[PDB]
Design a protein around this nucleic acid. Sequence first.
DNA 1: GGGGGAAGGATTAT
DNA 2: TCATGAATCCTTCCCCC
Length: 341
Amino acid sequence: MIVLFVDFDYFYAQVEEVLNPSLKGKPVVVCVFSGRFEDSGAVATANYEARKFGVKAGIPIVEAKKILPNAVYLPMRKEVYQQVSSRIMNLLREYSEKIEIASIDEAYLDISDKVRDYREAYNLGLEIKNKILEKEKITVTVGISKNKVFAKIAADMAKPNGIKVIDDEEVKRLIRELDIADVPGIGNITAEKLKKLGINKLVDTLSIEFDKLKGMIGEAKAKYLISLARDEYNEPIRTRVRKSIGRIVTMKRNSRNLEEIKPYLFRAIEESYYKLDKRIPKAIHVVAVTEDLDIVSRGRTFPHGISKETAYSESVKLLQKILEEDERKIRRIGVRFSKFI
DNA sequence: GGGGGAAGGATTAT
DNA sequence: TCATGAATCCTTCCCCC
Ligand SMILES: *[C@H]1c2c(cc3ccc4cccc5ccc2c3c45)[C@@H](O)[C@H](O)[C@@H]1O
Ligand SMILES: [Ca+2]
Ligand SMILES: [Ca+2]
Protein backbone atom coordinates (compact mmCIF):
# COMPACT_ATOMS: atom_id res chain seq x y z
CA MET A 1 0.00 0.00 0.00
CA ILE A 2 1.28 3.47 -0.93
CA VAL A 3 -0.46 6.26 0.98
CA LEU A 4 -0.49 9.97 0.19
CA PHE A 5 -1.57 12.20 3.08
CA VAL A 6 -2.46 15.83 2.54
CA ASP A 7 -2.59 18.30 5.42
CA PHE A 8 -3.55 21.90 4.61
CA ASP A 9 -1.18 24.24 6.50
CA TYR A 10 -2.71 26.46 9.20
CA PHE A 11 -5.89 26.10 7.12
CA TYR A 12 -8.37 28.60 8.60
CA ALA A 13 -5.72 31.31 8.90
CA GLN A 14 -4.49 30.57 5.42
CA VAL A 15 -7.99 30.82 3.93
CA GLU A 16 -8.47 34.20 5.57
CA GLU A 17 -5.19 35.30 3.94
CA VAL A 18 -6.42 34.13 0.56
CA LEU A 19 -9.64 36.11 1.00
CA ASN A 20 -7.68 39.13 2.29
CA PRO A 21 -4.11 38.86 0.93
CA SER A 22 -2.99 41.95 2.85
CA LEU A 23 -2.79 39.70 5.91
CA LYS A 24 0.13 37.73 4.50
CA GLY A 25 3.19 38.30 6.66
CA LYS A 26 1.05 39.46 9.61
CA PRO A 27 0.24 37.38 12.71
CA VAL A 28 -3.25 36.06 12.01
CA VAL A 29 -5.32 34.43 14.74
CA VAL A 30 -8.58 32.68 13.84
CA CYS A 31 -10.73 32.39 16.96
CA VAL A 32 -14.00 31.05 18.22
CA PHE A 33 -15.51 33.81 20.36
CA SER A 34 -17.91 32.26 22.90
CA GLY A 35 -19.90 35.38 23.91
CA ARG A 36 -19.64 34.70 27.65
CA PHE A 37 -17.40 37.77 28.26
CA GLU A 38 -14.99 40.11 26.43
CA ASP A 39 -12.61 37.98 24.29
CA SER A 40 -13.85 34.72 25.85
CA GLY A 41 -13.43 31.65 23.63
CA ALA A 42 -10.53 29.82 22.03
CA VAL A 43 -7.99 30.12 19.23
CA ALA A 44 -8.96 27.80 16.40
CA THR A 45 -5.67 28.33 14.55
CA ALA A 46 -2.89 30.85 14.09
CA ASN A 47 -0.60 31.30 11.12
CA TYR A 48 3.11 30.72 11.73
CA GLU A 49 3.74 34.45 12.24
CA ALA A 50 1.56 34.12 15.37
CA ARG A 51 2.68 30.60 16.31
CA LYS A 52 6.28 31.75 16.59
CA PHE A 53 5.26 33.67 19.67
CA GLY A 54 3.29 30.89 21.34
CA VAL A 55 -0.21 31.72 20.00
CA LYS A 56 -1.54 28.32 18.95
CA ALA A 57 -4.75 26.28 18.56
CA GLY A 58 -6.81 25.70 21.72
CA ILE A 59 -5.52 28.49 23.94
CA PRO A 60 -7.85 31.23 25.23
CA ILE A 61 -8.22 34.34 23.07
CA VAL A 62 -7.44 36.46 26.15
CA GLU A 63 -4.15 34.60 26.60
CA ALA A 64 -3.42 35.18 22.91
CA LYS A 65 -4.20 38.89 23.00
CA LYS A 66 -1.84 39.32 25.95
CA ILE A 67 0.93 37.95 23.78
CA LEU A 68 0.00 39.65 20.52
CA PRO A 69 -2.39 42.57 21.07
CA ASN A 70 -1.72 43.93 17.58
CA ALA A 71 -2.18 40.58 15.76
CA VAL A 72 -5.21 40.28 13.50
CA TYR A 73 -7.96 38.40 15.33
CA LEU A 74 -10.58 37.02 13.04
CA PRO A 75 -13.77 35.23 14.02
CA MET A 76 -13.87 31.67 12.67
CA ARG A 77 -15.85 31.49 9.41
CA LYS A 78 -16.27 27.72 9.30
CA GLU A 79 -18.66 27.73 6.32
CA VAL A 80 -16.12 29.51 4.15
CA TYR A 81 -13.31 27.13 5.15
CA GLN A 82 -15.56 24.11 4.58
CA GLN A 83 -16.27 25.20 1.01
CA VAL A 84 -12.65 25.91 0.15
CA SER A 85 -11.88 22.52 1.73
CA SER A 86 -14.52 20.67 -0.29
CA ARG A 87 -13.03 22.15 -3.45
CA ILE A 88 -9.55 21.00 -2.49
CA MET A 89 -10.88 17.57 -1.57
CA ASN A 90 -12.38 17.43 -5.05
CA LEU A 91 -9.01 18.23 -6.55
CA LEU A 92 -7.60 15.31 -4.59
CA ARG A 93 -10.21 12.89 -5.96
CA GLU A 94 -8.73 13.56 -9.42
CA TYR A 95 -5.53 11.88 -8.26
CA SER A 96 -7.20 8.93 -6.55
CA GLU A 97 -10.78 7.77 -5.97
CA LYS A 98 -9.59 5.95 -2.86
CA ILE A 99 -9.69 8.93 -0.57
CA GLU A 100 -10.31 9.23 3.15
CA ILE A 101 -11.21 12.74 4.25
CA ALA A 102 -10.16 12.63 7.90
CA SER A 103 -11.16 16.20 8.60
CA ILE A 104 -11.66 19.60 7.04
CA ASP A 105 -7.96 19.84 6.22
CA GLU A 106 -6.63 16.33 6.06
CA ALA A 107 -7.03 13.56 3.55
CA TYR A 108 -5.48 10.20 2.85
CA LEU A 109 -5.16 8.94 -0.69
CA ASP A 110 -4.44 5.30 -1.43
CA ILE A 111 -2.36 5.83 -4.55
CA SER A 112 -1.13 2.22 -4.78
CA ASP A 113 -2.91 1.67 -8.10
CA LYS A 114 -1.57 5.02 -9.36
CA VAL A 115 2.13 5.01 -8.50
CA ARG A 116 4.67 2.18 -8.65
CA ASP A 117 7.33 3.47 -6.24
CA TYR A 118 7.96 6.29 -3.76
CA ARG A 119 9.64 8.39 -6.47
CA GLU A 120 6.42 8.41 -8.31
CA ALA A 121 4.44 9.16 -5.30
CA TYR A 122 6.70 12.11 -4.47
CA ASN A 123 6.29 13.46 -8.01
CA LEU A 124 2.52 13.10 -7.62
CA GLY A 125 2.83 14.85 -4.28
CA LEU A 126 4.53 17.82 -5.93
CA GLU A 127 1.90 17.72 -8.64
CA ILE A 128 -0.85 17.77 -5.99
CA LYS A 129 0.87 20.54 -4.06
CA ASN A 130 1.24 22.68 -7.20
CA LYS A 131 -2.36 22.05 -8.29
CA ILE A 132 -3.84 23.16 -4.97
CA LEU A 133 -1.55 26.18 -4.93
CA GLU A 134 -2.59 27.10 -8.47
CA LYS A 135 -6.31 26.50 -8.06
CA GLU A 136 -6.87 27.71 -4.48
CA LYS A 137 -3.70 29.49 -3.36
CA ILE A 138 -3.46 27.04 -0.47
CA THR A 139 -0.17 25.42 0.52
CA VAL A 140 -0.42 21.89 1.92
CA THR A 141 2.04 19.38 3.25
CA VAL A 142 2.19 15.91 1.73
CA GLY A 143 3.20 12.87 3.74
CA ILE A 144 3.84 9.65 1.87
CA SER A 145 4.41 6.24 3.38
CA LYS A 146 3.24 2.60 3.69
CA ASN A 147 0.20 3.21 5.84
CA LYS A 148 -2.01 6.07 7.03
CA VAL A 149 -0.14 6.61 10.31
CA PHE A 150 3.36 7.09 8.91
CA ALA A 151 2.08 9.19 6.03
CA LYS A 152 0.61 11.44 8.73
CA ILE A 153 3.86 11.39 10.68
CA ALA A 154 5.70 12.16 7.42
CA ALA A 155 3.50 15.23 6.98
CA ASP A 156 3.94 16.19 10.65
CA MET A 157 7.70 16.27 10.11
CA ALA A 158 7.58 18.16 6.80
CA LYS A 159 5.10 20.92 7.62
CA PRO A 160 4.56 23.65 6.60
CA ASN A 161 4.47 23.68 2.78
CA GLY A 162 6.46 20.46 2.76
CA ILE A 163 6.55 16.94 1.32
CA LYS A 164 8.16 13.92 2.90
CA VAL A 165 8.33 10.24 2.07
CA ILE A 166 9.08 7.70 4.77
CA ASP A 167 10.22 4.52 3.04
CA ASP A 168 9.97 0.98 4.43
CA GLU A 169 13.38 1.53 5.98
CA GLU A 170 12.80 4.86 7.74
CA VAL A 171 9.65 3.34 9.16
CA LYS A 172 11.79 0.75 10.96
CA ARG A 173 14.06 3.50 12.27
CA LEU A 174 11.07 5.54 13.50
CA ILE A 175 9.56 2.54 15.27
CA ARG A 176 12.74 2.77 17.39
CA GLU A 177 13.58 6.51 17.58
CA LEU A 178 10.21 8.42 17.37
CA ASP A 179 8.73 9.71 20.65
CA ILE A 180 5.61 7.60 21.03
CA ALA A 181 3.82 10.86 21.84
CA ASP A 182 4.28 11.90 18.23
CA VAL A 183 2.16 8.96 17.09
CA PRO A 184 -1.31 9.96 15.69
CA GLY A 185 -4.05 9.18 18.16
CA ILE A 186 -1.87 9.41 21.21
CA GLY A 187 -2.69 12.61 23.03
CA ASN A 188 -1.44 13.99 26.35
CA ILE A 189 -3.30 11.51 28.53
CA THR A 190 -2.17 8.31 26.79
CA ALA A 191 1.36 9.64 26.47
CA GLU A 192 1.66 10.20 30.21
CA LYS A 193 0.12 6.82 30.99
CA LEU A 194 2.59 5.16 28.61
CA LYS A 195 5.40 7.02 30.37
CA LYS A 196 4.40 5.50 33.73
CA LEU A 197 4.40 2.03 32.16
CA GLY A 198 7.90 2.68 30.88
CA ILE A 199 7.04 3.07 27.19
CA ASN A 200 8.50 6.06 25.30
CA LYS A 201 9.10 4.73 21.78
CA LEU A 202 6.93 2.39 19.70
CA VAL A 203 9.36 -0.52 20.02
CA ASP A 204 8.92 -0.45 23.82
CA THR A 205 5.28 -1.65 23.50
CA LEU A 206 6.72 -5.01 22.50
CA SER A 207 8.78 -5.42 25.68
CA ILE A 208 5.80 -4.88 28.02
CA GLU A 209 3.20 -7.62 28.32
CA PHE A 210 -0.19 -7.06 26.67
CA ASP A 211 -2.50 -7.25 29.72
CA LYS A 212 -0.52 -4.47 31.40
CA LEU A 213 -0.72 -2.20 28.34
CA LYS A 214 -4.39 -3.04 27.87
CA GLY A 215 -5.13 -2.18 31.47
CA MET A 216 -3.37 1.18 31.36
CA ILE A 217 -4.16 2.72 27.93
CA GLY A 218 -7.07 0.49 26.87
CA GLU A 219 -7.37 -2.52 24.58
CA ALA A 220 -7.99 -0.47 21.41
CA LYS A 221 -5.01 1.82 21.84
CA ALA A 222 -2.87 -1.10 22.99
CA LYS A 223 -3.39 -3.22 19.87
CA TYR A 224 -2.92 -0.11 17.75
CA LEU A 225 0.52 0.79 19.12
CA ILE A 226 1.60 -2.84 19.05
CA SER A 227 0.53 -3.24 15.40
CA LEU A 228 2.46 -0.11 14.58
CA ALA A 229 5.50 -1.36 16.49
CA ARG A 230 5.28 -4.70 14.65
CA ASP A 231 5.08 -2.73 11.40
CA GLU A 232 1.78 -4.55 10.87
CA TYR A 233 -0.52 -1.54 10.69
CA ASN A 234 -2.30 -1.40 7.34
CA GLU A 235 -5.75 0.10 7.89
CA PRO A 236 -7.59 0.72 4.60
CA ILE A 237 -8.25 4.21 3.26
CA ARG A 238 -12.03 4.43 3.57
CA THR A 239 -14.83 6.95 3.15
CA ARG A 240 -15.50 8.58 6.48
CA VAL A 241 -19.08 9.23 7.52
CA ARG A 242 -19.84 11.76 10.23
CA LYS A 243 -21.45 9.64 12.94
CA SER A 244 -22.89 12.40 15.09
CA ILE A 245 -23.88 16.04 14.71
CA GLY A 246 -24.60 18.52 17.45
CA ARG A 247 -25.03 22.08 18.57
CA ILE A 248 -23.74 23.50 21.83
CA VAL A 249 -24.68 27.01 22.96
CA THR A 250 -23.36 29.27 25.71
CA MET A 251 -26.04 30.69 27.99
CA LYS A 252 -26.18 34.36 29.01
CA ARG A 253 -25.70 33.28 32.65
CA ASN A 254 -25.13 29.97 34.46
CA SER A 255 -28.37 28.23 35.41
CA ARG A 256 -30.09 25.01 36.43
CA ASN A 257 -33.58 26.42 36.08
CA LEU A 258 -35.16 24.41 33.27
CA GLU A 259 -37.27 27.27 31.91
CA GLU A 260 -34.21 29.53 31.65
CA ILE A 261 -32.27 26.77 29.88
CA LYS A 262 -35.06 25.59 27.57
CA PRO A 263 -34.74 28.39 24.97
CA TYR A 264 -31.04 27.70 24.47
CA LEU A 265 -31.64 23.93 24.20
CA PHE A 266 -34.54 24.32 21.77
CA ARG A 267 -32.48 26.66 19.61
CA ALA A 268 -29.69 24.09 19.79
CA ILE A 269 -32.14 21.44 18.51
CA GLU A 270 -33.62 23.74 15.88
CA GLU A 271 -30.14 24.48 14.52
CA SER A 272 -28.97 20.88 14.86
CA TYR A 273 -31.79 19.71 12.61
CA TYR A 274 -30.61 22.12 9.96
CA LYS A 275 -27.06 20.81 10.22
CA LEU A 276 -28.43 17.27 10.13
CA ASP A 277 -29.22 18.28 6.57
CA LYS A 278 -31.55 15.45 5.54
CA ARG A 279 -29.98 12.99 7.98
CA ILE A 280 -32.42 11.28 10.33
CA PRO A 281 -31.04 10.34 13.74
CA LYS A 282 -32.36 7.53 15.91
CA ALA A 283 -30.32 8.72 18.91
CA ILE A 284 -30.22 12.00 20.81
CA HIS A 285 -27.99 13.27 23.61
CA VAL A 286 -28.39 16.38 25.72
CA VAL A 287 -24.98 17.80 26.58
CA ALA A 288 -24.47 20.05 29.55
CA VAL A 289 -21.25 21.98 30.11
CA THR A 290 -21.29 22.75 33.86
CA GLU A 291 -19.81 25.85 35.57
CA ASP A 292 -16.49 24.10 36.37
CA LEU A 293 -16.41 23.27 32.64
CA ASP A 294 -16.95 19.52 33.16
CA ILE A 295 -19.22 17.66 30.73
CA VAL A 296 -22.34 15.71 31.65
CA SER A 297 -24.55 14.07 29.05
CA ARG A 298 -27.67 11.93 28.79
CA GLY A 299 -29.05 10.27 25.68
CA ARG A 300 -31.64 7.84 24.37
CA THR A 301 -31.81 5.68 21.28
CA PHE A 302 -35.12 5.22 19.45
CA PRO A 303 -36.16 2.27 17.26
CA HIS A 304 -37.01 4.89 14.65
CA GLY A 305 -35.96 8.31 13.38
CA ILE A 306 -36.32 11.28 15.74
CA SER A 307 -38.56 14.13 14.58
CA LYS A 308 -37.79 17.70 15.62
CA GLU A 309 -40.88 17.47 17.79
CA THR A 310 -39.77 14.22 19.38
CA ALA A 311 -36.36 15.85 19.80
CA TYR A 312 -37.95 18.77 21.64
CA SER A 313 -39.79 16.67 24.20
CA GLU A 314 -37.09 14.04 24.70
CA SER A 315 -34.34 16.63 25.16
CA VAL A 316 -36.24 18.21 28.04
CA LYS A 317 -36.59 14.82 29.69
CA LEU A 318 -32.87 14.22 29.16
CA LEU A 319 -32.00 17.70 30.48
CA GLN A 320 -34.08 16.94 33.54
CA LYS A 321 -32.12 13.75 34.02
CA ILE A 322 -28.92 15.81 33.98
CA LEU A 323 -30.09 18.44 36.45
CA GLU A 324 -31.43 15.57 38.59
CA GLU A 325 -28.25 13.46 38.59
CA ASP A 326 -25.75 16.32 38.63
CA GLU A 327 -26.02 19.27 41.01
CA ARG A 328 -23.64 21.76 39.34
CA LYS A 329 -24.83 24.81 37.42
CA ILE A 330 -25.05 24.56 33.64
CA ARG A 331 -22.94 27.07 31.68
CA ARG A 332 -23.60 25.71 28.21
CA ILE A 333 -26.36 23.38 27.08
CA GLY A 334 -26.33 21.42 23.85
CA VAL A 335 -27.78 18.55 21.89
CA ARG A 336 -26.19 15.82 19.83
CA PHE A 337 -27.73 13.49 17.24
CA SER A 338 -26.34 10.21 15.97
CA LYS A 339 -27.17 6.77 14.62
CA PHE A 340 -28.49 8.10 11.33
CA ILE A 341 -30.78 6.03 9.15
C1' DG B 1 -19.31 -17.01 27.28
C1' DG B 2 -20.08 -13.72 24.13
C1' DG B 3 -23.03 -11.24 20.17
C1' DG B 4 -25.03 -7.19 20.01
C1' DG B 5 -25.67 -2.64 21.09
C1' DA B 6 -26.92 1.16 24.30
C1' DA B 7 -25.04 4.55 27.58
C1' DG B 8 -21.94 7.97 28.78
C1' DG B 9 -17.51 9.39 30.43
C1' DA B 10 -12.77 9.73 28.41
C1' DT B 11 -9.73 11.47 24.93
C1' DT B 12 -8.11 13.75 20.95
C1' DA B 13 -7.20 17.73 18.13
C1' DT B 14 -8.61 22.68 17.16
C1' DT C 1 -13.66 33.30 33.75
C1' DC C 2 -12.34 28.19 27.68
C1' DA C 3 -14.20 25.79 22.48
C1' DT C 4 -13.36 22.59 18.96
C1' DG C 5 -19.08 28.17 16.82
C1' DA C 6 -17.21 19.39 18.79
C1' DA C 7 -16.77 14.77 17.42
C1' DT C 8 -14.95 10.53 18.20
C1' DC C 9 -13.15 7.18 21.05
C1' DC C 10 -13.98 3.41 23.68
C1' DT C 11 -14.88 1.47 28.00
C1' DT C 12 -18.48 -0.43 30.70
C1' DC C 13 -23.06 -2.41 31.38
C1' DC C 14 -27.11 -5.21 30.24
C1' DC C 15 -30.18 -8.38 27.61
C1' DC C 16 -30.29 -12.62 26.18
C1' DC C 17 -29.36 -17.18 23.88
C1 LIG D 1 -21.06 25.19 12.56
C2 LIG D 1 -22.34 24.94 11.84
C3 LIG D 1 -22.43 23.97 10.78
C4 LIG D 1 -23.67 23.71 10.20
C5 LIG D 1 -24.79 24.45 10.55
C6 LIG D 1 -26.00 24.22 9.88
C7 LIG D 1 -27.13 24.99 10.21
C8 LIG D 1 -27.06 25.97 11.20
C9 LIG D 1 -28.20 26.72 11.52
C10 LIG D 1 -28.12 27.70 12.54
C11 LIG D 1 -26.90 27.93 13.23
C12 LIG D 1 -25.76 27.18 12.91
C13 LIG D 1 -24.55 27.41 13.58
C14 LIG D 1 -23.42 26.66 13.24
C15 LIG D 1 -23.47 25.68 12.22
C16 LIG D 1 -24.70 25.44 11.55
C17 LIG D 1 -25.83 26.20 11.88
C18 LIG D 1 -21.31 23.12 10.35
O1 LIG D 1 -21.26 22.89 8.98
C19 LIG D 1 -19.95 23.61 10.93
O2 LIG D 1 -18.94 22.65 10.72
C20 LIG D 1 -19.99 24.09 12.37
O3 LIG D 1 -20.29 22.98 13.17
CA1 LIG E 1 -3.47 21.42 8.87
CA1 LIG F 1 -5.96 19.23 11.11
